[PDB]
Amino acid sequence: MLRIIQSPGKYIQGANALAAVGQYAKSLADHYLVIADDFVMKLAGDTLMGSLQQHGVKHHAALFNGECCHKEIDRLGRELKAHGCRGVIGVGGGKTLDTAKAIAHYQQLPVVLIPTIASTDAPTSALSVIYTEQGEFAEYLIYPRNPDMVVMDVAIIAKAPVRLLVAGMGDALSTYFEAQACFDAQATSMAGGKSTLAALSLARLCYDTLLAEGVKAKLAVEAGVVTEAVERIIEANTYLSGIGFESSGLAAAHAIHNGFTVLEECHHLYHGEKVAFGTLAQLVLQNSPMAQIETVLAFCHRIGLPITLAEMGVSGDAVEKIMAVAQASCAAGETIHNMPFKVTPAGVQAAILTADRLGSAWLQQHQ
Amino acid sequence: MLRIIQSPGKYIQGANALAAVGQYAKSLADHYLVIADDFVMKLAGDTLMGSLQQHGVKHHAALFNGECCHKEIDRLGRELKAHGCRGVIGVGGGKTLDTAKAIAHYQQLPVVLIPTIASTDAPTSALSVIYTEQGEFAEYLIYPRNPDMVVMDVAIIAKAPVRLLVAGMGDALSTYFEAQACFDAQATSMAGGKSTLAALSLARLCYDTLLAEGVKAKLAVEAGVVTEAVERIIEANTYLSGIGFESSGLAAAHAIHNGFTVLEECHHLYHGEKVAFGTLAQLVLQNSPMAQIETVLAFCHRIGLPITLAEMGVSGDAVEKIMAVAQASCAAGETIHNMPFKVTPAGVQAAILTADRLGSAWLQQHQ
Amino acid sequence: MLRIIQSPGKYIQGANALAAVGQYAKSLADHYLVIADDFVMKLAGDTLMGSLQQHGVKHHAALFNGECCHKEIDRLGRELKAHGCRGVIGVGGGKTLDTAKAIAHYQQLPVVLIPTIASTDAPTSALSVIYTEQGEFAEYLIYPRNPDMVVMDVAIIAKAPVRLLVAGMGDALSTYFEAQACFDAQATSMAGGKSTLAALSLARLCYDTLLAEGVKAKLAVEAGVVTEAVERIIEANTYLSGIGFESSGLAAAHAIHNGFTVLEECHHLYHGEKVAFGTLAQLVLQNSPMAQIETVLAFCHRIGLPITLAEMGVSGDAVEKIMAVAQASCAAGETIHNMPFKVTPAGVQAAILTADRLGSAWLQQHQ
Amino acid sequence: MLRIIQSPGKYIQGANALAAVGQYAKSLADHYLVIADDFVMKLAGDTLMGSLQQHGVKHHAALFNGECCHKEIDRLGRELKAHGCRGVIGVGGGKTLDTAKAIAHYQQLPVVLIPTIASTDAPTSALSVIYTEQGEFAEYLIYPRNPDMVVMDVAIIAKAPVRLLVAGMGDALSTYFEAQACFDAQATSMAGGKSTLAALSLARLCYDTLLAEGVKAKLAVEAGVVTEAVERIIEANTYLSGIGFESSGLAAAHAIHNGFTVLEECHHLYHGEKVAFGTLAQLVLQNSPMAQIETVLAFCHRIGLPITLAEMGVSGDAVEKIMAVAQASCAAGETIHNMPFKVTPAGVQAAILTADRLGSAWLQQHQ
Ligand code: NA
Ligand code: NA
Ligand code: NA
Ligand code: NA
Ligand SMILES: [Zn+2]
Ligand SMILES: [Zn+2]
Ligand SMILES: [Zn+2]
Ligand SMILES: [Zn+2]
Ligand SMILES: [Zn+2]
Ligand SMILES: [Zn+2]
Ligand SMILES: [Zn+2]
Ligand SMILES: [Zn+2]
């Protein structure tokens, strides 16, 4: 009944954006804790601190210990309080960013996120995904506000391994299908209402950008460079997908992703790789026409995303393992109930096992 | 001049429908003879009797001796009379179902049919096909009413061998072409009049569902599971095709099927396999454009239906054998005279021999 | 411990041999019952009776009623006794030939067999295979002597459908592998002893002739003509294979063939088609090297013999059905115990299921 | 200067061996601690305890907590002492087996290992591989004696996912090349001397069995069954490879495997998958001829082992990451110095980067 859209205050993207972070950060605060692991500090630290200094922004670097846990969060909280910082900057990968969101939340301060990879649509969202230590989906943890600012330095991203860009396209790939399923069901998004037209359209624009630009961008990043295609994909993997999923909705593909986290065989594939397959399984679950399945199979195969259980490490008589995936995907509270029809574990198992068969037949025709 | 459509009273389909048969059967009678062979009783007996018991429906199981013959029919009639049953349930394959229709006819009682395979469109019809003992088409035997109720448990069907689903798609495949040929000829259907718009449209919907869903359903059933595609094909093979053929019309493809029953080389292929080829031959007989022939050849090849005489077991100098097929297909009273043009044995022989050549050339291009 | 080889007295082959049958038949008797069904009498009757008349051989035609049953046998016995015939001629297919062997056995008279097809290696042997009426292997029935004379008219055979020649090559294909397995096991043949060197060498010569001549012969028979390649294959399918199997030995392939007779899905494929697949399964059972499996797969695929369960009509979850095949193939008294190692139902099931997989992978590479 | 070969006392293999474990275990002790995790107890527990009971062998089950750590080892030690057990049985995967070896070592008792998968050649060896918690190779830990007995139930193994059999073939694949390199260098094995002729020949027999039987076995295990090919591969992955590597020698491939453990991108691939690629890199390092590289590439591609960095999860500008792999592979004490020539990090980096290119070119020709 209410339609709600939420968003980070400002999203900034472009080549060498890191060198301009000080103008934008200054507008929120004149003193920041900078959370980054050591690899990221060596990569990005001199440019960032340089930018901050140049705009009269004070900064204390803090070494992040790799994991997003209450201990590290409480620790970084105390450190912040002791130097008197009035803002948090997170720089690097997902665990660094999720940690910076939490620090800023508990200290009630503004946060600037600087992803150094574009492999998931997490950065813009008022969200963190908690797993167990064994790698098994635990909970969506939801903040009451979005990050203030998200800064995407495309030059940095295009030097990161192409596999991480592909995984982000895999995560982005589900956005349209989950958003349109929710929209059809009149389901409530994580923003707390029905989807706006805006959030659905951004989600569709995500899918359409991936199809137009995904191969061109992959080729550029394999060469280590930024073209306009790369700029478009980075927007698609980050802003379009991030607003689409948070303000428009999650459904079967992410629930199926969560369900796959109960199998050890997958546990090291990247989130977006698994979500791509979960999207395929969603297509079978909702009975998408063959032309649309073909389009998705050709896209995933062309950029290197998995289209069979074997490419996810799963072989043999996986009947029981996929029934376990299916039960977990259908747990109370999971997003798969946002589909515009009733879903059961047996239906999910069917969709998975069948998607595997579709992708295996597609591989045999090679194209 | 009159348009007539007839139908079973109720058609019910879905996963685990067998477990709900008691509510629906109760509405017609509170006491049933259950006709099933031993394999089917072992497969389905506990679920069915369980359902019946749970709704206060009384039941006597009777072991079916495999064949639909007057002896078995008269026998099962006497047995029914002796326990006082007020309804018949047929469960299993075609011969079991055809037997239950006859028992219910002679005893004038309501009948519930529970097909455990979806390999022909017989179940809904007021009809049985009589062969000789040598396997040669004898007659259409026509009842004055349709079965009261037809129950399709999709979970059971999806565990049956994929070859039986394919054969049902083969039988369903002819439905549109025969119905539209009859419609064009203003021919009289087995329902006794000209076709309604309804029966023709269901027949077209049959063809269109096969093209959209046939491969997807085949893949799911190869995995042993039910998806929405499987639900659609089962409806297509059963209800759409059954109403289409009975109330819209048969024409060349089924007459050609009947004609093939004079050759020993074919006699063990499934009905729908032969009907698929008979459909191809119908396309040549009525001079369908090449694009439509291509579509059908690609469909049959993609799901595993025969497109040449050699795939039907026929080789060598089959000139004389196909002339025998052609004479038999053109016998007085056969459905091939429902074509909107004059058909002769020589024309039928021509269409068969030519269809074989089309399918052999298609195989050489592989696609 | 004893080595024994047995043989028909004389085997005669060549184009238009039917027209010379009188010289050879005269040497055994001057008066024959001629057993042939009506189709065969119309095809071959005038040439045969012509030949017999021309050499002063008396003859009474008797119409064979299609089946090899004690009734028909006892009947034809009485008829023979009443005209005073001193010899039997069988002309046509396997059931006609098996009937003539029995008539000659019970009446203790000489028999001339004239096969009009070369689709099995039965004709030369002191044997008949009894099935049930449901098509299920019953028993080997063994006579105490071989037919006196076997006459192969190659012109007649080359006008018969190519599929029957292929099926005979399929039956012949097993001969070497079964003979060499028996030889290795020191197993006793149906001739009652260990194999001679002669019977084993004929069996090997069978395999080697099929590989050299099989495609060339198939091409000629597709054109309806006799070349030297066709003459060689007919000898291979008839004399080489017949002596090889009777005097050298049967083993897994024929036991597996027998086991497949418990499935309805196969029951109409020709004997040699099934035996070809049973040969493949034997290769897996005895762990033949991949190069030898490849050779056989390429031969069967090149001439049109089945290399998968699906080409034998078997699909879906055939785990239980193949366990039934395997149990039946291992029954007490079956030939599979002639293998040079211990065989169990589980091993046979394994070999079958694995052979199917080999042949399916071969089909995917097309070659 | 001394040649030394060591071995488990007895290696036993075959279908349903688990049901015969009691006769063999009884010969070493009449009372065992049985170490198995819960999944394995549910799978194998009733058969094993059944066998033990039937031969008068006493047994206390102990639940293994998944990890091979001193804590779990010391714990299981105390438990053993308290019930008075005179032997240890390990049943399941590598961590369970490595734990049972340690328990038996510290308690100085006999040990029976029952692997339920054939994915590495660890079981027969007097060895455990210690990693860090971050998954990074730590040390070879060496016991002074081999396990007393190793029991391979082939029926159990053939029901395990095919991917685990493939990974064991990947581990086995390196055995010949590392053994022959050591032999050539006159390097000292983990058994403490120069290689015997016996250990080298078993290693070669390993390679030759993989090439003859690997595809056939893979096909059988995909069907869930045991053929002779599967029996041969299980021997190859377990006994042949285990003696080959321990008593003949490790060299570049396993050192390169260890070096890859410093990258997160690989950390979840199975040991044998990584070792297969490390074998390829060894081929380039020692300049194997192209025909031998082709043979290995075709084998790995045909069974599903990785032949490029991308199939190991590594993409982009991996120059620095592969230099890190190369440094770690060349650490003091690593097995790569067993090569018959001087190896440097730069040479290893070269071999890796070049192997990737070979495998990528091979993929482009598809074959
Ligand atoms: Na998404
Ligand atoms: Na129809
Ligand atoms: Na034979
Ligand atoms: Na090894
Ligand atoms: Zn500060
Ligand atoms: Zn995601
Ligand atoms: Zn009753
Ligand atoms: Zn039909
Ligand atoms: Zn006579
Ligand atoms: Zn035979
Ligand atoms: Zn104890
Ligand atoms: Zn290893």
Please give a quick description of this structure.
This is part of a larger assembly, with 4 copies of chain A (367 residues). Chain A has 367 residues and is an alpha/beta fold.
Structural description of this entry:
- It is classed as oxidoreductase.
- This is part of a larger assembly, with four copies of chain A (367 residues).
- Chain A has helices spanning 21-26, 38-54, 70-83, 94-106, 154-159, 162-185, 197-222, 228-248, 252-260, 271-285, 290-303, 319-329, 345-365, and strands at 10-14, 31-36, 58-63, 88-92, 111-115, 127-131, 137-142, 149-153.
- Chain A is an alpha/beta fold and 367 residues long.
- In chain A, helix 6 (162-185) runs parallel beside helix 8, helix 7 (197-222) runs antiparallel to helix 8 and helix 10 packs across helix 13 (345-365).
- Chain A is globular.
- Chain A has two domains: 1-159, Rossmann fold, CATH 3.40.50.1970; 160-367, Up-down Bundle (Dehydroquinate synthase-like, alpha domain), CATH 1.20.1090.10.
- Chain A starts with 9 loop residues before the first strand and ends with a helix.
- The complex binds sodium ion (4 copies) and zinc ion (8 copies).
- One sodium ion binds next to helix 6 and helix 8 of chain D.
- One zinc ion is lined by residues 31, 33, 60, 83-85 of chain C.
